[PDB]
Write an enzyme that holds these catalytic residues in place. Structure first.
Site, short mmCIF file in Angstrom:
data_model
loop_
_atom_site.label_atom_id
_atom_site.label_comp_id
_atom_site.label_asym_id
_atom_site.label_seq_id
_atom_site.Cartn_x
_atom_site.Cartn_y
_atom_site.Cartn_z
N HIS F 104 0.80 -1.23 0.00
CA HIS F 104 0.00 0.00 0.00
C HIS F 104 0.84 1.28 0.00
O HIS F 104 0.30 2.36 0.17
CB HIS F 104 -0.98 0.01 1.19
CG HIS F 104 -1.72 -1.27 1.39
ND1 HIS F 104 -1.20 -2.32 2.12
CD2 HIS F 104 -2.95 -1.67 0.99
CE1 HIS F 104 -2.06 -3.32 2.13
NE2 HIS F 104 -3.14 -2.95 1.46
N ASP F 205 37.30 -27.24 17.78
CA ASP F 205 37.62 -28.53 17.23
C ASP F 205 38.86 -28.59 16.35
O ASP F 205 38.76 -28.49 15.17
CB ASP F 205 36.44 -29.17 16.53
CG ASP F 205 36.58 -30.67 16.41
OD1 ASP F 205 37.65 -31.15 16.06
OD2 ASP F 205 35.59 -31.33 16.67
N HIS F 208 39.58 -32.69 14.66
CA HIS F 208 39.05 -33.24 13.39
C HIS F 208 39.95 -32.93 12.19
O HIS F 208 39.84 -33.58 11.15
CB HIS F 208 37.62 -32.73 13.13
CG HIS F 208 37.55 -31.37 12.50
ND1 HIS F 208 37.85 -30.21 13.19
CD2 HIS F 208 37.18 -30.98 11.25
CE1 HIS F 208 37.69 -29.17 12.38
NE2 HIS F 208 37.28 -29.61 11.21
N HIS F 213 39.98 -33.23 7.14
CA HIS F 213 40.54 -32.43 6.05
C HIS F 213 41.81 -33.05 5.44
O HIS F 213 42.58 -32.36 4.78
CB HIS F 213 40.80 -31.00 6.54
CG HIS F 213 39.56 -30.26 6.93
ND1 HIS F 213 38.57 -29.93 6.03
CD2 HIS F 213 39.15 -29.77 8.13
CE1 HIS F 213 37.60 -29.29 6.66
NE2 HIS F 213 37.93 -29.17 7.93
N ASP F 362 33.66 -31.04 5.60
CA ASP F 362 32.88 -30.99 6.85
C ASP F 362 31.40 -31.34 6.66
O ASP F 362 30.72 -31.67 7.63
CB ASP F 362 32.96 -29.58 7.43
CG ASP F 362 34.32 -29.23 7.99
OD1 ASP F 362 34.80 -29.93 8.89
OD2 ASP F 362 34.86 -28.18 7.58
C1 LIG Z 1 41.27 -25.28 8.77
C2 LIG Z 1 41.02 -25.22 10.25
C3 LIG Z 1 42.08 -25.03 11.14
C4 LIG Z 1 41.82 -24.98 12.51
C5 LIG Z 1 40.52 -25.12 12.99
C6 LIG Z 1 39.46 -25.31 12.10
N1 LIG Z 1 38.13 -25.45 12.57
O1 LIG Z 1 37.84 -25.51 13.94
O2 LIG Z 1 37.21 -25.55 11.78
C7 LIG Z 1 39.73 -25.36 10.73
S1 FES Z 2 1.79 -0.50 3.19
FE1 FES Z 2 0.28 -2.05 3.63
S2 FES Z 2 1.50 -3.86 4.10
FE2 FES Z 2 2.97 -2.25 3.81
FE LIG Z 3 36.59 -28.66 9.40
#
Ligand SMILES: Cc1cccc([N+](=O)[O-])c1
Ligand code: FES
Ligand SMILES: [Fe+3]
Ligand SMILES: Cc1cccc([N+](=O)[O-])c1
Ligand SMILES: Cc1cccc([N+](=O)[O-])c1
Ligand code: FES
Ligand code: FES
Ligand SMILES: [Fe+3]
Ligand SMILES: [Fe+3]
Lengths: 446, 192, 192, 446, 192, 446
Positions: F104, F205, F208, F213, F362
């Site tokens: 509107h 982490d 991992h 990786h 991942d």
């Molecule tokens: C490539 C990389 C290096 C360190 C930590 C992470 N991470 O926690 O995803 C990833």
């Molecule tokens: S002006 Fe009516 S919904 Fe935005």
């Molecule tokens: Fe990772």
């Protein structure tokens, strides 16, 4: 919904509320009271014959690894790492001594034990109690003539007792034939139906065949083909129906050893089954030898179905109230010639596989019946399973279980749903048993 | 292609590549495109009898497999790798066609709608059988029915075609290794 | 095609098949492919004025129908079988184009993204009008907008094209029988 | 949520909680208190004129079969088999004496009765009480000048009383014109909006037209086109707004008989409507004859909308809180020349159909307004409908209902949502009536 | 195309149109189709080393952008319009290929399945560099893995190809402006 | 579920119930107790530098407009019209003095105020109180060295206090480097994981990296590459872990200034960071100058993560329990040469963007760990985060926060989840504080 009190299945199994095929809260409740409680099909010896062989399988919505141990036993474990919960195995089958997690590299044995942790000494020292970190094991794993089932509930009856009166009917083919093999890998297809729709159809439903499968009967070149379009009712005494305490049931169509197989296979099969029947007469008697070469449409409660002789073996894997993942294997007799086994396996898939023309006939029936269970005006409606009620017997001198001595009826629906309702309203096996102490009397009323 | 170096490539796929990399015949690619476009047209309008008559050889093998998911490093587990979704001879295709045309095929009312998209056509004559034409093509197949059901299929087809009655080139083998392990299309009741 | 035998085939579809099965002219198929590829390119870049100028004849009928789902055995119910999603003359297409280009078309900001895939091209001159070219083709049309809206359309197009001003072949009829009865694409506001 | 107590719509309909367009629990509650309770559009006589003609239609999320009986009446039934619950009819329209279920072959009449069961004698004997197994019937089916509505609730007011003060405005076109025809089949498209978003827009919303439809007004060649981009406000007395006890309402834009139709149709239409108006002056008076040829944007509560003169007829079929299936028909006057009817039908679809360029303008408005009702910070926010509040009247000597004597306002929103809230907080029609005994006083406050 | 009149058309898109509207060489379109079909075949079978060797030039730029959603009327906000999903030289493509082939790429077991559909091929020689071939084509790319994961990608590709070692035409630039702003495919880890 | 009582995270953060990654009711509860309560990343000064510049951003599932005011401040507002609730802005970035609603035509300023209403005089007269109809404003908007965060809860601690002990680690790069720029636009991709899966991975982490990786480490040409396939454990003292009262935490990998960047960028980066470190030694001391050029994997609670030096900046935008929309920007140091900034930005996307080959590694880990949290047998299972427990310290003379003086452990998981559980079980900030009065003692037990 109060599952202790709600009458979802009426007395004697005569009707069920349509909502049972649609209600997601009930589906979640089934995970606990059906799937976590009962015996579920995992695999066959023929698929994991050697030490280290494994497959993945569903048990309800859970995924498990099923592994042949060095001592020849089979153990099954949740396919979930004990560290941060990653799925351990991403394949369907293989051979291995263990399983390594791709997240942080934890290594589990084929026996489920946590065997190694990268840099354990430097990182955890002696603090990680690996003995307590084995994969979560399926409490119960047992075999019925090579067919392997699992159960998460330690309190369940043994598999054989759980089969109840159904076992007597299965044994001629599963045992006295020399044994069966499962031919993998299965077909896998998702359908938009509740798992109970195909489960009920296979347990108990000969009535649909002539009409639902009219085109497949007419086109397909098969032994039951006089049924096409309800052109002819099976003769008097063409078969029977049975059901059992723990919900398993089947139809018996006398002599139909070639099953759904197209005319190409009919003569060969009818010769092979007849010849084995002649040998079995001497060993197990004429009635049971005849059962061996008779077509059984069976559901092993809750969600494993089969057509013996046709060789169709099904798992209706639940996903949600209107979604099911259908696994289809072929069963063959071990002593059939290998070329016949090959052609039988292809024919099973041709008829009942992912492009199974017979199976296709059933799609809309199962899908819409399931989906209608969500619709507002149908939730509280009654699905009927009264055909043959008041003519079933129990304790017959020849045929065990609750038996309808007619080829077409709803005997097996009634027993399936009586068992279903007893489980849904019970917290454990003891309560199921208490709820089932007059099971056959309930089913044979009137 | 050296599959010891290109570690992800199967021997089968390497063999099929070699086929098309050699003699390229532009005219043959054009003929193959026509052939496949006409085939797809007949299927899309559900002229299944016409498809059998005009497109399918008496000696046909029509095969679609589904292969079990195995470890890329797997080398011990030896059991059947695949199942046949289709593995049809001419008589078996004819059964399926009769099933489609049967007036008590309830699932065919209201009538289905099919649309096929054929791409990536390659064609090469066989080395040893000068009358055998290898054709590869990819298909997207759209099936619609019942107001709101829509299923789309995706596949590569390895075909062999040969001149049959009247000199008409007809399908003698189709092989499809279906790429989705678990079908999310209700079924695979379509001719890829 | 005998439609008494091929029970699933419509008279209309059988007539269209016959058209392309006769004279095959490879050069005409190539011209038609160019024509359609250029048309799709202009549409994909949203050069709607250029599309009208270069691709669309003054006498055009641009028609997309949606057909009611009826029983395959139905033979008594006689009322209008279809409705027109599009049934446009040149002036009506021009209205739609102006609507697209209007700076107060709020739905066009941020700009839409279109990608079209044209396949299965067949071409045949009309028997009676030597200047009328019949072209059939299938389209997948991908429309993306607003971060996460994605709509994919699938259709077969029955076209007639004729040489117009400057000898440029232009669209004089397009007919699409849309295969999905209930659209799951928010709308059909795309030029198929 | 406690629907007895929760204020979802504020006093006088002045605002609504944004969650009403997003909340799935409320959607499920609407199935009971809106869709199972109120009158819903099914079809027109013109679509099922002969005995045996039928169509399928939605009523809420339920699907029904609507069938012309031999005696000339119309009856409607749930499209669900009484045996195991399969969907009976898979087509949208046809002619038949009955409907046979594709699962087990049960045959129902056009009158809903269970007429046949395959092999009944051999299978059920005399035990199946077919008299009790008729399809579940829609309790109430009534006509407003050929337009057929259904209601599952036997306690509902008659359709005519339910239209309340809206009927007076509709009658010149629906009745005094000689009658209307619905031109099928409808367009069908799913949108990601709550059903109330388009319902509210059509009932009551002239404010959006100039801005929302700026491009369609400018491009499209039409009679209301001076509004493009809010370039010009309609003059004083260009129209009015009304609403009614049971929630139906409309805007009236005086004289706009060519509606949204492009300049191609404007002269022809303006001639035709003017000529009929001249005849009607003598029969129904100048005011009502003028109303006949005036553009009415109307919602028949809950979910049927229309633009008279433009000829747009809509059903907003609910799927879930953010999904609606839009059905679009064309309405034409029976005595128009057939070629004009054809062109009018195409023009309705051209503007408001699946590829309707006007309808397209509304998509984002309805979709995002609906989807925002799910967002955490917006659930408890207030959608405003206060424009014109404190200037509405009731009981006017010329124009009945609660009336705002201005072309642009939110009078009809207020009445729609007052009715909505009265239903949501009531268990039955008696409670709705008690909750509505001062409806017009509430709406005309301040 | 006049972009002052065709208000929705970008200068870039107008320039690309002009390229193909001039000299049409049917033989060049056919060569380009072969080239792209063979490229897609190598990619579909995961012969990534073979793809680099046979299809990709040493001087390649392989670029896929994602453009921020901006107002169609926007004329003041000037910051980086796009990011590079890919913007790879040959060595960077080789890194990605090694990553695909590494036996500890856990995501590649069980093996992925790819199917590519290449359509709308246009080809034109560069005006100033007689050895530079411009090729435009659209791709649908279907990736399936792990039983029930299915991702479908849709894109238009603006390529330049040039004859390299052995006279083999190789890719020297690919540019894709990815049409979906928010990917709903888990990632864009596919070679478009 | 009773969130006051349910133990979702065990004492000391040692484990979490797997259901936390799957449970939709908990997700809805997080909208209230995590996302409506805590500080969430919006944008950077570098993306809206001039008056009138704006971007859209998510805060939980809500969308906001973030606008540079004329006075140089930034204000943020719900992207929802105050009239009928339409989404106001459909683009991701731009420059404007206001925003007009396409429904509107209501016009709001860059300052959120309702500035104009079409035909206000004729329609509303003086009755519309525009002063009360401004866009719903984000209560709190604050900057950390150009990085702009928002919070809907007026009671939240200031952003700086909320960063707690994490701020000390971030300041060398965010402040003492001369400042950072965010390079837009971000990549955007939806993944089928819970937002906590990537949040926990980035916070804490390092375990991992070598295994997850392995392929990216081997292929990718980078400084941490000796880790590929767990071929080598980082040496003693290669890094540390920390966590903080309000849940933010990070790993520190000493000296890894080139991060994930491929050998192409390694020498250039190692030179640039080393040269700046030499200057910073004099200003902030050797330890903090070293931290500047050390790789920090950090999560700013709840859902903003980064890898400093690698230059990866992430927002894990929640959609539902198993769906997250991942936004990826590049961070660069303002005083780097422009050509280096360009190549760094591309390298961030190359590694961690929509086609990021590292990020791809991942995917399955996060997706399956999340999805398994829905599976029946895993809901009540315990995700483990005990690595390094009983060796963390607090109040160290050199390194603040709860600190594990080892490169690889689960210190930061424990602090993240301790904060998470304190929020989920609290109704407001006062309750969180009461639940956190012994936070560091809890984390350093045993
Ligand atoms: C490539 C990389 C290096 C360190 C930590 C992470 N991470 O926690 O995803 C990833
Ligand atoms: S002006 Fe009516 S919904 Fe935005
Ligand atoms: Fe990772
Ligand atoms: C083909 C066949 C034959 C008997 C029974 C069934 N059934 O219950 O599905 C199917
Ligand atoms: C084109 C038009 C004209 C008046 C009213 C509406 N409306 O409420 O949708 C639409
Ligand atoms: S999740 Fe399996 S090792 Fe960490
Ligand atoms: S479900 Fe209809 S006849 Fe059985
Ligand atoms: Fe069946
Ligand atoms: Fe509108």
């Amino acid at each position: 919904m109060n599952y202790n009190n709600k009458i979802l299945v009426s007395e004697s199994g005569l009707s069920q509320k349509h909502l049972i095929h649609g209600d997601e809260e009930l589906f979640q409740h089934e995970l606990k009271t059906i799937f976590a409680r009962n015996w579920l099909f995992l695999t066959h010896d023929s698929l994991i014959p050697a030490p280290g062989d494994y497959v993945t399988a569903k048990m309800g919505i859970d995924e498990v690894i099923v592994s042949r141990q060095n001592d020849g036993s089979i153990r099954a474990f949740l396919n979930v790492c004990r560290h941060r919960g990653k799925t351990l195995v991403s394949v369907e089958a293989g051979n291995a001594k263990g399983f390594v997690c791709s997240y942080h590299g934890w290594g589990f044995g084929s026996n489920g034990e946590l065997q190694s942790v990268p840099f354990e000494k430097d990182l955890y020292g002696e603090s990680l109690n690996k003995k307590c970190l084995g994969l979560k094991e399926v409490a119960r794993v047992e075999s019925f003539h090579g067919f392997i089932y699992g159960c998460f509930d330690q309190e369940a009856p043994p598999l054989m007792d759980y089969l109840g009166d159904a076992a007597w009917y299965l044994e001629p083919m599963f045992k006295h034939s020399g044994g069966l093999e499962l031919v993998g890998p299965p077909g896998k297809v998702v359908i938009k139906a509740n798992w109970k729709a195909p489960a009920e159809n296979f347990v108990g439903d000969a009535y649909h065949v002539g009409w639902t499968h009219a085109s497949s009967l007419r086109s397909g070149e098969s032994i039951f083909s006089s049924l096409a379009g309800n052109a002819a009712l099976p003769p008097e005494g063409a078969g029977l129906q049975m059901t059992s305490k723990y919900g398993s049931g089947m139809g018996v169509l006398w002599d139909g050893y070639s099953g759904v197989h197209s005319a190409d296979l009919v003569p060969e099969l009818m010769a092979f089954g007849g010849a084995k029947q002649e040998r079995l007469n001497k060993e197990i008697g004429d009635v049971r030898a005849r059962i061996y070469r008779s077509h059984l449409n069976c559901t092993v409660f809750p969600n494993n179905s089969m057509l013996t002789c046709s060789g169709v073996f099904k798992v209706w894997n639940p996903i949600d109230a209107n979604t099911t993942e259908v696994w289809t294997y072929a069963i063959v007799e071990k002593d059939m010639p290998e070329d016949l086994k090959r052609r039988l396996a292809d024919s099973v898939q041709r008829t009942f596989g992912p492009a199974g023309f017979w199976e296709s006939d059933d799609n809309d029936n199962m899908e819409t019946a399931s989906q209608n269970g969500k619709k507002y005006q149908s939730r509280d409606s009654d699905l009927l399973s009264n055909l043959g009620f008041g003519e079933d017997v129990y304790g017959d001198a020849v045929y065990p279980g609750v038996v309808g001595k007619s080829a077409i009826g709803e005997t097996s629906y009634r027993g399936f749903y009586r068992a279903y309702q007893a489980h849904v309203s019970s917290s454990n096996w003891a309560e199921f048993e208490h709820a089932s102490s007059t099971w056959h009397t309930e089913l044979t009323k009137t | 292609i050296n599959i010891q170096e290109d570690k992800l490539v199967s021997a089968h796929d390497a063999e099929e590549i070699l086929r098309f990399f050699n003699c390229h015949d532009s005219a043959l690619q054009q003929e193959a495109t026509t052939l496949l476009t006409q085939e797809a047209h007949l299927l899309d309008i559900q002229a299944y009898r016409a498809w059998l008559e005009h497109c399918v050889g008496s000696e046909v093998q029509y095969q679609v497999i589904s292969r079990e998911l195995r470890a890329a490093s797997e080398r011990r587990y030896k059991l059947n790798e695949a199942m046949n979704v289709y593995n049809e001879n001419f008589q078996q295709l004819k059964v399926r066609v009769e099933h489609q045309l049967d007036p008590q095929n309830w699932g065919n009312s209201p009538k289905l709608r099919f649309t096929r998209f054929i791409t990536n056509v390659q064609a090469a004559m066989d080395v040893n059988d000068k009358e055998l034409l290898h054709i590869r093509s990819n298909v997207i197949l759209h099936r619609a029915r019942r107001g709101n059901q829509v299923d789309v299929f995706y596949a590569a087809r390895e075909d062999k075609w040969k001149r049959g009655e009247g000199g008409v080139r007809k399908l003698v083998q189709r092989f499809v290794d279906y790429p989705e392990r678990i079908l999310q299309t209700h079924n695979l009741m379509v001719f890829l």
